[PDB]
Ligand binder design. Structure first.
Ligand SMILES: O=C(CCCC[C@@H]1SC[C@@H]2NC(=O)N[C@@H]21)Nc1cccc(S)c1
Ligand SMILES: O=C(CCCC[C@@H]1SC[C@@H]2NC(=O)N[C@@H]21)Nc1cccc(S)c1
Ligand SMILES: O=C(CCCC[C@@H]1SC[C@@H]2NC(=O)N[C@@H]21)Nc1cccc(S)c1
Ligand SMILES: O=C(CCCC[C@@H]1SC[C@@H]2NC(=O)N[C@@H]21)Nc1cccc(S)c1
Lengths: 124, 124, 125, 125
């Protein structure tokens, strides 16, 4: 339903690139390249979306994860984005995210960052 | 993967939910989640990522995963992402924070996302 | 005394159409009223919070937060929101926040007691 | 006047060993001091917040929140924390919270300005 719509190349307000393919079964797979932080080149992402959403004008729920390890860098961290795809003229993926990095137990209290990313198909 | 063995297997949270996961050598997480609460019945597909080469200073291993709450029985038009870290040892744990987003209209988007925290252990 | 006391004091507006009226004290206090354009809210609610009255000099923002409990002389939504964020000065002064809204639940329902979001405030509607 | 005014008023301790000393006013006010056992913090910091002074009578918790800006006479960590949560009274009284900690950043570093966590406070040390 929203498979073709979600599938494609997305950019957030930071200039990050999210290249994703939505599967018929609810899979999300692709690559993420962050414009910020301890990150270089593309990282693997996987996630899930609701492949049969409400038809009442509601968005499509989805989420995905990046672990920040590739051949170039390892930031000992993972980000999860949770949010919704909104179709139509101004297609957009509005998210909140959590970034956890590996800490000792004594440091676990400041292990997790929160933020928000909005993605569109136009590079801003 | 340094914790591929420690992570793979069955986990239980404070609410009585069950998470079965395989951790791949390449940083993949795949499995199923069965929730003890909410609009949830039976198992749901889970996918995520973990750091397959963590620090060796006693830091945890960062990870995350997504469940979209659609299976053959039920569709709650929502998805949860868990972001956290695995901590090995006698009392292995996965400590997470999570975001649950449900599909909303634009007018209801301000209240589309819940936040919480779950701790998983290997013992029921 | 307070470095951004002048910049923060006044009326702010968010992306929802809500209105935040605040006074920053020299001692770090935030006092004022919040009027929400959405939810189980009517008219103005008391707000109280704190800000860093001696921020860093290097162009960093000024950290702040405040709370609104959603009870007033009209309604009681058995809930409270906290906003955490920073004030950025200049033209297009802004207060960029993340928020948590907790509502009172039984223990059985506490897992879904807390919403999260983000609000941006500017001096112009 | 407040339903849980006496229940909330007093000293609370979290899982980190931090100490929260609070007075609940009749009108919904929270005032007091916070002393963190961790981070760039020393001694007591001013807190202010709000609680629902007339909660539901169905065994629901009492929604509340408060803010600390991490500046006192000893130290300034250019940051503020807000706790959003609920009070549950009775045998083992507890305040269960989620929190947001924002530190002052430049605009380029704003994306990593806010930490999130959860604290549970009880009356015992
Ligand atoms: O820097 C990294 C790795 C890359 C994160 C990129 C983030 S993910 C959310 C946001 N959205 C984007 O597009 N980019 C940013 N990890 C790390 C480790 C320890 C502390 C901190 S702050 C960060
Ligand atoms: O109920 C569901 C689907 C199942 C969620 C289970 C949650 S995921 C985080 C936590 N950890 C667990 O183990 N279980 C819970 N979605 C939904 C949609 C719209 C509004 C609401 S309130 C809920
Ligand atoms: O509706 C209310 C009372 C008013 C909340 C207004 C919010 S505060 C963050 C955001 N920013 C604004 O300006 N407005 C909104 N409480 C309540 C209780 C139970 C469930 C839910 S969803 C909501
Ligand atoms: O360190 C401080 C000042 C004290 C924070 C204490 C926290 S508040 C939530 C939690 N609950 C407690 O009881 N204690 C902790 N600020 C600061 C600035 C920049 C980055 C970071 S990580 C931290």
């Amino acid at each position: 339903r929203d498979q073709a719509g979600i599938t494609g190349t997305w950019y957030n307000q930071l200039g990050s690139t999210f290249i994703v393919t939505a599967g018929a079964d609810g899979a999300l797979t692709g690559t993420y390249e962050s414009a910020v932080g301890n990150a270089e080149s593309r990282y693997v992402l996987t996630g899930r979306y609701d492949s049969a959403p409400a038809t009442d004008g509601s968005g499509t729920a989805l989420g995905w994860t990046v672990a920040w390890k590739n051949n170039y860098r390892n930031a000992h961290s993972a980000t999860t984005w949770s949010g919704q795809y909104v179709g139509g003229a101004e297609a957009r993926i509005n998210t909140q995210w959590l970034l956890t990095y590996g800490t000792t137990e004594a440091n676990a209290w400041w292990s997790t960052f929160v933020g928000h990313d909005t993605f569109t198909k136009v590079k801003p």
